[PDB]
């Protein structure tokens, strides 16, 4: 197995995806050896070569239709076997906890696509397997299970995706079970961090991102008190930080545009809640900075900016 994997003529056949029949047979050959524990170790050495080919097959699967039964991958006999095997192959090697942590951190971008396949397909063979692999990495038993949940939640927005998935149950007991378990783990891990801690950790890096508790009002209410150290010094920190981003490093370039929209969202929530923060915006000069974002391009930045202006405004005149 280990030699044949390194060796060229067989591995070439498997890289070609054009010829579904040949490729299918070869992927199955390997996945069956993987049902046995020992082969998993040699197979994981060669992961780099075959594993982009397998994610490509899932990607192809996503862009084509399902409302015909042409020669290519659809939801035909041929297709139903190719998807299943690819996924299954993944799933097998994921049984070893260390491989799974590694697999998400390298392959992250490619990894996120499994959630998509779960929607588009109505087939419990495809759906089930996709749900299980993601589950296994999010399990406690994977070391740095925290890390993988973080990458998935922040960047890839895994959590909202699961909440939709949960609604559409398909007939298969085990599927329903996997989906529910995964909903709990994702949601629980991020929220359960202390509120002040997450905000400040983001503040410090100047690498603010929306997250489930920063669009939630409750987070802000508990945290108002934590800021007060010289008239909401931390709150003033976020105001300084926002002002700076617009003016230095310019506005209207991509990096600076992610931080702004999030920051304006965060400020809005504290002001609606607290009437005493209006003073802080005036002293700092933040009051001015809001007015500037309004004119600026990017729809999402302008929405958040408008909501910030209105929050100050409601309080000035009673």
């Amino acid at each position: 197995v280990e030699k044949l994997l390194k060796n060229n003529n067989l591995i070439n056949i498997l890289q070609n995806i054009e010829q579904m029949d040949t490729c299918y047979v070869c992927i199955r050959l390997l996945q069956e050896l993987a049902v046995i524990p020992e082969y998993r170790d040699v197979i994981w050495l060669h992961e780099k070569k075959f594993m982009p080919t397998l994610f490509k097959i899932l990607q192809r699967a996503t862009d084509s239709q399902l409302a015909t039964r042409i020669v290519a991958t659809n939801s035909n006999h041929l297709g139903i076997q190719l998807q299943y095997h690819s996924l299954l192959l993944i799933w097998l090697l994921t049984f070893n906890p260390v491989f799974a942590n590694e697999l998400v951190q390298k392959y992250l971008s490619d990894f996120l696509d499994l959630l998509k396949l779960v929607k588009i397909t109505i087939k419990e063979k495809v759906s089930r397997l996709c749900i299980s692999i993601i589950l296994q990495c999010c399990s406690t038993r994977v070391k740095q299970h925290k890390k993988v949940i973080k990458q998935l939640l922040l960047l890839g927005n895994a959590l909202p995706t699961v909440q939709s998935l949960s609604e559409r149950k398909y007939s298969d007991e085990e599927l329903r079970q996997d989906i529910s378990n995964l909903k709990e783990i994702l949601e629980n891990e991020y929220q359960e961090l202390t509120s002040f801690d997450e905000y400040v950790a983001e503040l410090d890096s100047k690498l603010l991102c929306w997250s489930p508790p920063h669009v939630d009002n409750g987070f802000w209410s508990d945290n108002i008190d934590e800021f007060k150290k010289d008239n909401y010094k931390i709150f003033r920190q976020l105001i300084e930080l926002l002002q700076a981003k617009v003016r230095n490093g310019d506005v209207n370039a991509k990096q600076e545009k992610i931080i702004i929209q999030v920051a304006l969202n965060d400020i809005t929530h504290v002001v609606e809640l607290l009437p005493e923060s209006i003073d802080v915006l005036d002293k700092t000069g933040g009051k001015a900075d809001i007015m500037e974002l309004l004119n600026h391009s990017d729809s999402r930045v302008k929405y958040e900016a408008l909501k910030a202006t209105q929050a100050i405004i409601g309080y000035t005149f009673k």
Partner: protein
């Protein structure tokens, strides 16, 4: 090619087979649907039915706001020009439509409450602009505090008389009554700084806005100077709101009809298929068949005499 789903009772199974036949349906096999466990009576479809009721509510709420009224009687066909255009011949993914309506529902609720809060404050401050200017000139106590003035708006000079009548009966002739015509009525009472509360009681009971000092914005010297800059924030912040709302309105009007047609069509599939026990003890035949998509058109032309040929 594309799955088509038909329901009838077994009685017009033959009558159906021939008509379907003449239109270009192929691989016509009568079934039940237990041989497709997900697309049979189970909890799963019943949850989908709820998901569509939520969809229905969201469209109606968005149309109300937009001042565009519901179009109904429904296209779900693929015969029609519009049928092809506003309903894709492909499959439906419930998840996508829920998420699309979610984002728009959330945006509107912000937009609608924000227009009303911003707008009300503006109409008042523009009203109290002229009021504080006129009232200071009526002078040598414009930024005074040892004299009490009562500035106030009142709907009309008629309502103001009734106030004058209370005052004269119950407080004596300690007022000087002046009035300026607006577009409203500027009324002015002028009093001591220790009889304020008694004047206030009259003002509250006849619906007047006679405050000691009008506005919460007073803070520059003159009062008006602060008021005039705060009126420039109000005007431009309302306009930006109106633009975001307008933009989005032109963007989604057309989209809402298409998702509405799509969602109707999902309800119908579930029903055809049997999503509850009642559909079962009313029609017991559910058949399956494959229709090429280049011919999808002709099947929808005749909706079916007591047959549903609404398909995917």
């Amino acid at each position: 090619m594309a799955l088509v789903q038909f329901y009838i009772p077994q009685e017009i199974s033959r009558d159906s087979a021939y008509t379907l036949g003449q239109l270009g349906l192929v691989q016509f096999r009568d079934l039940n649907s237990k041989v497709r466990a997900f697309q049979r009576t189970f909890v799963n479809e019943i949850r989908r039915l709820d998901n569509v009721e939520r969809q229905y509510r969201y469209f109606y709420s968005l149309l109300k706001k937009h001042d565009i009224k519901l179009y109904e009687g429904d296209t779900d066909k693929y015969l029609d020009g519009s049928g092809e255009l506003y309903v894709p011949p492909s499959g439906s993914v419930i998840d996508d439509y829920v998420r699309n309506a979610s984002y728009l529902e959330e945006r509107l609720i912000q937009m609608e409450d924000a227009t009303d809060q911003i707008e009300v404050q503006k109409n008042d401050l523009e009203q109290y602009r002229f009021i504080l200017q006129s009232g200071d000139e009526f002078i040598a106590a414009a930024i005074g505090a040892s004299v009490n003035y009562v500035t106030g708006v009142i709907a009309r000079d008629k309502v103001a008389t009734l106030e004058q009548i209370l005052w004269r009966v119950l407080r004596g002739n300690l007022f000087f009554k002046t009035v300026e015509i607006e577009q409203n009525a500027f009324i002015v009472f002028s009093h001591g700084d220790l009889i304020i509360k008694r004047i206030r009681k009259i003002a509250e009971s006849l619906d007047a806005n006679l405050y000691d000092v009008d506005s919460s914005n007073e803070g520059r010297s003159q009062q008006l100077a602060k008021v005039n800059k705060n009126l420039s924030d109000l005007y431009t912040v309302l306009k930006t709101t109106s633009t975001t709302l307008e933009s989005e309105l032109y963007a989604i009007a057309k989209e809402l009809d298409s998702w509405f047609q799509d969602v109707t069509r999902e309800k119908a599939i579930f029903e055809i298929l049997n999503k509850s026990n009642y559909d079962t003890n009313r029609k017991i035949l559910i058949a399956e068949g494959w229709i090429p998509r280049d011919e999808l058109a002709t099947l929808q032309a005749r909706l079916g005499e007591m047959i549903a040929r609404l398909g995917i």
